[PDB]
Design an enzyme around this catalytic site. Structure first.
Site, PDB file in Angstrom:
ATOM      1  N   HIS A   1     -10.698   3.942 -39.667  1.00 32.27           N
ATOM      2  CA  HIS A   1      -9.981   4.313 -40.867  1.00 32.27           C
ATOM      3  C   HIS A   1     -10.660   3.634 -42.054  1.00 32.27           C
ATOM      4  O   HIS A   1     -10.765   2.408 -42.085  1.00 32.27           O
ATOM      5  CB  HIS A   1      -8.513   3.921 -40.796  1.00 32.27           C
TER       6      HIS A   1
ATOM      7  N   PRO B   1       4.629  -7.610 -39.229  1.00 34.48           N
ATOM      8  CA  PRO B   1       3.494  -6.693 -39.105  1.00 34.48           C
ATOM      9  C   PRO B   1       3.068  -5.895 -40.352  1.00 34.48           C
ATOM     10  O   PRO B   1       2.177  -5.075 -40.255  1.00 34.48           O
ATOM     11  CB  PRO B   1       3.960  -5.731 -38.001  1.00 34.48           C
TER      12      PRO B   1
ATOM     13  N   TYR C   1      -6.643  -6.826 -46.305  1.00 39.78           N
ATOM     14  CA  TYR C   1      -6.218  -5.925 -45.241  1.00 39.78           C
ATOM     15  C   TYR C   1      -7.304  -5.800 -44.165  1.00 39.78           C
ATOM     16  O   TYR C   1      -7.004  -5.868 -42.985  1.00 39.78           O
ATOM     17  CB  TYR C   1      -5.763  -4.591 -45.828  1.00 39.78           C
TER      18      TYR C   1
ATOM     19  N   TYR D   1       2.114   3.168 -45.934  1.00 42.43           N
ATOM     20  CA  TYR D   1       3.099   2.109 -46.091  1.00 42.43           C
ATOM     21  C   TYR D   1       3.993   2.530 -47.254  1.00 42.43           C
ATOM     22  O   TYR D   1       3.510   2.621 -48.376  1.00 42.43           O
ATOM     23  CB  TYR D   1       2.436   0.767 -46.410  1.00 42.43           C
TER      24      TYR D   1
ATOM     25  N   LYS E   1      -1.699  -8.106 -39.113  1.00 41.93           N
ATOM     26  CA  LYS E   1      -2.457  -9.334 -38.867  1.00 41.93           C
ATOM     27  C   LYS E   1      -2.184  -9.987 -37.503  1.00 41.93           C
ATOM     28  O   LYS E   1      -2.994 -10.818 -37.055  1.00 41.93           O
ATOM     29  CB  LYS E   1      -2.150 -10.326 -39.991  1.00 41.93           C
TER      30      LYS E   1
END
Ligand SMILES: Cc1cc2nc3c(=O)[nH]c(=O)nc-3n(C[C@H](O)[C@H](O)[C@H](O)COP(=O)(O)OP(=O)(O)OC[C@H]3O[C@@H](n4cnc5c(N)ncnc54)[C@H](O)[C@@H]3O)c2cc1C
Ligand SMILES: Cc1cc2nc3c(=O)[nH]c(=O)nc-3n(C[C@H](O)[C@H](O)[C@H](O)COP(=O)(O)OP(=O)(O)OC[C@H]3O[C@@H](n4cnc5c(N)ncnc54)[C@H](O)[C@@H]3O)c2cc1C
Ligand SMILES: [Cl-]
Ligand SMILES: [Cl-]
Ligand SMILES: [Cl-]
Ligand SMILES: [Cl-]
Ligand SMILES: [Cl-]
Lengths: 398, 397
Positions: free
Chosen positions: A75, A296, A389, A204, A300
């Protein structure tokens, strides 16, 4: 019977224990893994899906990446959805080349289990009451019960890879460990379905009704989450209630393209930030969830477990190949430096995208809103999120 | 008989004077009323750091000559954590933006001299100033001076009367909503006639608490120490102040610090405060009358300036282009920038201060982690620098 003998005794056959064991074995360091549950039971756990490059590299180094590379999906971006608007973070362009790999923890775990099968490195499942002993002595050992018999493992070092409810952390005497914790007033209700993901990248979403995450494990396997109050139980959430609520927290455009279906797995995970210091005591080293937990929201958890494995593995290689026994004193310092960075980011993302209701005062709610504005508008803010990220670097071992 | 003007301005601090100066120049009549005497207003020692937007505004108002001559352009600022010095090259990180160090008192003095030279009316020692008919078409002020009640008829009222003004309290019950965060500390400031310890500001975090090494010129230093809310200035001798400042700086920095007697010394409590909306009828709240920030981000006076900028550009369009629709845009425009400054000021305060037991162990750990992240990540520094030099004014079109 007589005691089994090895160099590193590993408690837990989750991703941490398996990856560590696989790396150690390939480097000629003998290890035995003991796991409380059955192989099937470990494989039944649906958990993480987002792998940072550091984790991918470690898996490649361990020689268990053929399937990940073929069936996993790189991704190059992620979307943050605030106020109904879709903001894409081009991780690749924002970080000058870095990406993430979407491949199920279950898959990673299965691959590691098949690789250990092929090597013959000893692993023992359904081991009851694993207890570590003589953590300060020169000859530490494990005891456990299986097939109605007490069995012993003599080793040099013990790696506690036994997760949030492990025995390792609890085996260290009082006073030694200090705990830092933030308990969030919500959990994530997760639903895995045999349906096409609504988007090729994770979404998200912050919505007035609460947080929602649109995720996946493949081109035909989707994973959706909803924040829910701590009281709520999974029995109170039928497949339809979950689909309707997910639809209510997404823009109409996405809601219409969403293909729903029966849940292959559904469960609620309470969110918490947790860290213990130090992450070792004598010849016992805590790894992954046995030492720290993150919410979450930053993907991580598994990635921090992997960095813990990284540091312990690279120290041990030098302990046995170069006789640098005392280098293990830098395990906690190294691990913790990266743990705090991931903990910070995980905390930041949770605060940024969740509904805290009455648990945050009016000022803090305004700051959440101004942060959502700044971080998704400022080019430097987007870069702040993107570089965190994809995962901050591993430091070199001296 | 009654005084007549277009815009009646309450408060002769920086907000009121700058708005009045700009309006007067645009041909929009305005009268300023101030509760205190002119001398008393000049006695206040506050801000020292100006964003380019504020500098541009003062040049546009024709009151920049002395600033351009005596003010000092700073290309960077230093952040100090556990001995480490991290210089922020504002110019390099923001694409050429800088900040101007020039005292708020100097700016105030210059504005006062410019209004005197223009003859634009200003009334000092205006007691019990009160606004009336806020929603009517003929709003007005009353006040008492020299034993008589006076009246000012106007089209619009600008409340530039600060934290303790009357404007905010004049708006009907429940219209305004107050957002606030009260910090468990204040800033003990000391102005000294000594060379600053550094040519650039130094924001220092220390186990013992926050310290700021600042200045007003090359011959005048301004230092600040965070102190608990209980503290009184009379509990802080110059000696105690200097010793504590040194204790909060790396020994190598403290070593060459030049101390001296205080010219001014006082404690200002820290608070984050935003009022919404920032207007009611023909009454507009400007600057500290509407919002407060902790000075850790140097945003106070600069937010006041942007409030003034928006109200001023709107009024120009109201009077010269009949754009009465634009008055409804004052609060939206001003609040967009106010919230950004508030966020940054809050961020910096959280990052650099000791909260004692007002923060649990987890939040202290996130402060430590934020200090590590924002001061070592190139993107982190960019983030701080672009916020510090001040985000752009949006266009009033
Ligand atoms: C319930 C849950 C849900 C999660 N969901 C997500 C998610 O949706 N997204 C995300 O990004 N991350 C998620 N995570 C985080 C991520 O999956 C974990 O960080 C990761 O599993 C850590 O791996 P580990 O090997 O350290 O611990 P684990 O994966 O928990 O492995 C520990 C192993 O040790 C064994 N064990 C425990 N006690 C003993 C004992 N006494 N003796 C012997 N063996 C023992 C356990 O059976 C287990 O097999 C989740 C974690 C949990 C616990
Ligand atoms: C005590 C204090 C210390 C500060 N310290 C710092 C610092 O160290 N660093 C920093 O960067 N910023 C600091 N600031 C912030 C900055 O100086 C302010 O944001 C700035 O002064 C705002 O200007 P203003 O004209 O809006 O308000 P003010 O400067 O407060 O002006 C308001 C004026 O209105 C008058 N007035 C009030 N009520 C009435 C009434 N009823 N009728 C008539 N007139 C009235 C007052 O006398 C005053 O002259 C400080 C602010 C305060 C209040
Ligand atoms: Cl999974
Ligand atoms: Cl961040
Ligand atoms: Cl990271
Ligand atoms: Cl090292
Ligand atoms: Cl700003």
């Amino acid at each position: 019977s007589n005691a089994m003998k090895t160099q590193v005794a590993i408690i837990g056959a989750g991703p941490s224990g398996l990856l560590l064991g696989q790396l150690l074995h390939k480097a000629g360091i003998d290890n035995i893994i003991v796991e409380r549950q059955t192989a099937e039971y470990v494989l039944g756990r649906i958990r993480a899906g987002v792998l940072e490059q550091g984790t991918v590299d470690l898996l490649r180094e361990a020689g268990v990446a053929e399937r990940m590379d073929r069936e996993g999906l790189v991704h190059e971006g992620v979307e943050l959805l605030v106020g109904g608007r879709r903001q894409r973070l081009d991780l690749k362009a924002l970080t000058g080349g870095k990406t993430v790999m979407v491949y199920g923890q279950t898959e990673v775990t299965r691959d590691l289990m098949q690789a250990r099968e092929a090597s013959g490195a000893p692993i023992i499942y359904s081991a009851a009451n694993v207890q570590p002993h003589e953590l300060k002595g020169e000859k530490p050992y494990l005891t456990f019960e299986k097939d109605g018999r007490v069995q012993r493992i003599d080793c040099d070092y013990i790696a506690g890879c036994d997760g949030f409810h492990g025995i390792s952390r609890q085996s260290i005497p009082e006073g030694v460990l200090k705990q830092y914790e933030r308990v969030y007033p919500f959990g994530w209700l997760g639903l895995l379905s045999d349906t096409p993901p609504v988007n090729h990248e994770l979404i998200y979403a912050h919505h007035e009704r609460g947080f929602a995450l649109c995720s996946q494990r493949s081109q035909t396997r989707s994973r959706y989450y909803l924040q829910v109050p701590l009281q709520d139980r999974v029995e109170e959430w039928s497949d339809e209630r979950f689909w309707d609520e997910l639809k209510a927290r997404l823009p109409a455009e996405v809601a219409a393209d969403l293909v729903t279906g029966p849940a292959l797995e559904k469960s609620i995970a309470p969110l918490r930030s947790l860290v213990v210091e130090p992450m070792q005591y004598g010849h016992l080293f805590l790894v992954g969830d046995a030492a720290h937990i993150v919410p979450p929201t930053g993907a991580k958890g598994l990635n921090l477990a992997a960095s813990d494995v990284n540091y312990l593995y690279r120290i041990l290689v030098k302990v046995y190949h170069e006789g640098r026994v005392d280098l293990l004193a830098q395990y906690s310092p190294l691990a913790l430096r990266r743990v705090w960075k991931g903990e910070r980011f995980s905390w930041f993302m949770t605060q940024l995208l969740h509904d805290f209701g009455s648990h945050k005062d009016a000022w803090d709610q305004k700051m959440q809103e101004a942060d959502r504005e700044y971080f998704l508008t400022s080019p430097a803010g987007l870069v702040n999120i993107a570089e965190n990220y994809v995962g901050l670097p591993f430091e070199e071992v001296a």
